[PDB]
Amino acid sequence: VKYYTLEEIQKHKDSKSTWVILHHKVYDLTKFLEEHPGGEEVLREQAGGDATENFEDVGHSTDVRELSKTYIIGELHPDDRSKIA
Numbered sequence: 001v002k003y004y005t006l007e008e009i010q011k012h013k014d015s016k017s018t019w020v021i022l023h024h025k026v027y028d029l030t031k032f033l034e035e036h037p038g039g040e041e042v043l044r045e046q047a048g049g050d051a052t053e054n055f056e057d058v059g060h061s062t063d064v065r066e067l068s069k070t071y072i073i074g075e076l077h078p079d080d081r082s083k084i085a
């Protein structure tokens with residue numbers, strides 16, 4: 001996986017490209033964005049910060065982890081990941 005800092009993810013704050021750093025692991029649900037029963041403006045609404053907060057809020061099933069696999073992108077820089085602290 002490529003270590004991209006928010007400097008990049010930030011550029012992925014749109015429909016075409018919308019990720020959500022969760023558990024230090026950013027996911028590219030820009031594809032399954034429409035396949036998500038959540039929304040289209042709520043998934044991207046957090047396409048810049050941490051969605052894990054909102055993602056964990058709704059309380060996603062434990063079988064959701066296996067859900068997104070191919071969509072996954074990797075994990076933003078580990079140095080920047082500790083910066084979001």
Ligand code: HEM
Binds near residue numbers: 039046052054059
């Ligand atoms: C990329 C990973 C994600 C996957 C694989 C995923 C998967 C799912 C699935 C299968 C549902 C149905 C069951 C459930 O989990 O409640 C759902 C619902 C939902 N998801 Fe996600 N989700 C993801 C990320 C997010 C994020 C980042 C948000 C927003 C912060 C979000 C918000 C919601 C909401 C609001 C619901 C609908 C629950 C209800 O009826 O109120 N999800 N998600």
